[PDB]
Design an enzyme around this catalytic site. Structure first.
Site, PDB file in Angstrom:
ATOM      1  N   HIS A  61       0.848  -1.181   0.000  1.00  0.00           N
ATOM      2  CA  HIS A  61       0.000   0.000   0.000  1.00  0.00           C
ATOM      3  C   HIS A  61       0.889   1.239   0.000  1.00  0.00           C
ATOM      4  CE1 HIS A  61      -3.098   2.857   1.240  1.00  0.00           C
ATOM      5  NE2 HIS A  61      -4.021   1.906   1.247  1.00  0.00           N
TER       6      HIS A  61
ATOM      7  N   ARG B  66      -7.168  10.168  -0.377  1.00  0.00           N
ATOM      8  CA  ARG B  66      -6.845  10.616  -1.732  1.00  0.00           C
ATOM      9  C   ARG B  66      -8.085  10.715  -2.609  1.00  0.00           C
ATOM     10  NH1 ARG B  66      -3.779   6.128  -3.189  1.00  0.00           N
ATOM     11  NH2 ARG B  66      -3.639   5.295  -1.053  1.00  0.00           N
TER      12      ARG B  66
END
Ligand SMILES: Cc1cc2nc3c(=O)[nH]c(=O)nc-3n(C[C@H](O)[C@H](O)[C@H](O)COP(=O)(O)OP(=O)(O)OC[C@H]3O[C@@H](n4cnc5c(N)ncnc54)[C@H](O)[C@@H]3O)c2cc1C
Length: 471
Positions: free
Chosen positions: A251, A274
């Protein structure tokens, strides 16, 4: 069903909690829920972004158009020609029913959306309110089991601090019990004819990373220390097929704790940060350097190449508009000193950037101008920066770095969630199932954000439904 021997569910993450609830409530099939940890939830309870669903009531309410066909499209593209397509079909086609199941049976709202990397539309669900999705879902499903146990303790027993070490089979070749070590370290046997492995991934085990993806052994992880691949090793010794074990998801955005910078364990900076509007800055130049809303393997690859080889991190930067749509999570992150609210002038100096404040303002104003083509082709730009942002305006900033996160590989299963015997299409045993991160093939080369919680409900319900035909 008339009560016989219990069904043993191994693991109290979302996969195990789903299997357990479906068995007790729909068919009255008794369950013993074993977990080697001292509390319920595994890595599921830590989930921050949400659970995917295609063609939901929530998407209807918010007027987003999505189909099982489009979800399958995005999933196939992320897998990159690995995995098992009927499992990718099943995951996306049952996603509506999975979301609805949580809504109607547990009154979980799941009323908000976010669009994560590699998704064509927003489909990752979370509930409004103060509780993040992993905790809210686990709390709800585990409370129902305790409520049921309280009325009839022989219908469900939850036994923490109980580490499964093997399955005993009879002369050929059926389940007769599950071998586990109790809280005192004593070997115990739970007599049973049916077992569902819901025991999680292997991302925490350095020993298994060295075997299946050795380049990742020095990376930090988001995974709890219980995440050691126990089920994968047990079923492999018993004769099960393992698939895609070398596909490990790194990740891109694990949080760096500024007072504990080299902890092997990180708080995760949710991908929702995000999708809901956050951007990434290079930690020396202070400029954007990549498409933040690509799939996780791509973002990680971009960070590991474009950010400094030593000190391989990035600044996750979020506007006030991001904050107003993710308030309680960001407040939590700030309580752990992981996100800081800082003016742009102070942003430059506390992070020793090369850009000037006025230069960063100019970049952020250009980024937020949706009428100018994005440098890095970012597909969704929302909750960006105010058109009149200045050097004294405040933003929210954290430091993030790539982390071992999720193991796409695991034991081979079929559409009934039954474990597949090595080199065969036959089930290893009539009574051995697996669901959740312990299994392989659903995601291929990369798991889309929001799809593992989904996988847990889809295949946890499936294992429960198919045990009911055999109990
Ligand atoms: C910080 C973090 C955030 C995440 N956020 C999201 C998100 O927003 N959306 C999404 O889709 N996915 C998310 N994921 C991934 C997802 O939450 C996990 O893959 C999910 O928990 C998988 O569920 P599970 O039930 O298979 O495993 P788990 O939730 O890990 O449960 C496994 C359980 O099995 C127990 N166990 C292990 N071995 C044994 C044994 N031998 N005997 C008995 N019990 C055993 C473990 O102690 C553990 O409690 C996140 C993961 C992490 C680490």
């Amino acid at each position: 069903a008339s009560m016989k021997q219990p069904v043993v569910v191994i693991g109290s993450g979302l996969a195990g909690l789903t299997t357990s609830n479906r068995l007790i409530s729909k068919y009255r099939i008794p369950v013993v829920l074993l977990d080697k940890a001292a509390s319920i939830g595994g890595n599921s309870i830590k989930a921050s972004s949400g659970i995917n669903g295609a063609h939901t009531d929530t998407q209807q309410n918010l007027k987003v158009m999505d189909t099982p066909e489009l979800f399958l499209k995005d999933t196939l593209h992320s897998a990159k020609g690995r995995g098992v397509p009927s499992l990718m079909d099943k995951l996306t086609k049952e996603s509506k029913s999975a979301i609805r199941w949580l809504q109607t049976e547990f009154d979980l709202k799941l009323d908000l959306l976010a669009q994560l990397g590699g998704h064509s539309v927003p489909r990752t669900h979370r509930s409004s309110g103060k509780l993040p999705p992993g905790f809210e879902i686990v709390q709800a499903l585990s409370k129902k089991l305790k409520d049921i146990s309280s009325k009839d303790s022989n219908l469900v027993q939850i036994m923490l601090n109980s580490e499964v070490v093997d399955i005993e089979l009879d002369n050929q070749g059926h389940v007769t019990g599950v071998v586990y070590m109790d809280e005192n370290g004593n070997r115990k046997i739970m007599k049973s004819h049916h077992v569902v492995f819901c025991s999680g991934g292997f991302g925490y085990s350095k020993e298994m990373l060295k075997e299946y993806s050795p380049n990742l052994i020095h990376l930090p992880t988001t995974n709890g220390k219980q995440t050691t691949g126990d089920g994968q090793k047990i079923l492999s010794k018993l004769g099960a097929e393992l698939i895609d074990m070398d596909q490990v998801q790194v990740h891109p955005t694990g949080f760096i704790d500024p007072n504990d910078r080299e902890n092997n364990w990180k708080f995760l900076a949710a991908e929702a940060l995000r999708g809901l509007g956050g951007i990434l800055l290079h930690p020396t130049t202070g400029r954007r350097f990549t498409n933040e809303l690509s799939t996780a393997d791509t973002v990680t690859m971009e960070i590991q190449s474009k950010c400094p080889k030593n000190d391989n991190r990035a600044l996750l930067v979020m506007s006030d508009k991001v904050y107003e749509n993710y308030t309680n999570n960001i407040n939590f992150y700030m309580s752990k000193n992981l996100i800081k609210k800082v003016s742009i002038n102070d942003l430059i100096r506390q992070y020793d950037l090369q850009t000037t404040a006025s230069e960063l303002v100019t970049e952020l104003k250009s980024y937020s101008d949706v009428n100018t083509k994005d440098t890095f082709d970012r597909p969704l730009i929302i909750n960006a920066f105010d058109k009149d942002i200045s050097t004294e305006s405040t933003v929210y900033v954290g430091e993030v770095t790539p982390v071992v996160h999720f193991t796409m590989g695991g034991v081979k299963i079929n559409e009934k969630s039954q474990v597949i015997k090595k080199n065969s299409e036959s089930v290893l045993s009539n009574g051995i199932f697996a669901a959740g991160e312990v299994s392989g093939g659903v995601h291929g080369a990369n798991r889309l954000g929001g799809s593992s919680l989904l996988e847990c409900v889809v295949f946890g319900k499936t294992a429960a439904d198919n045990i009911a035909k055999l109990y």
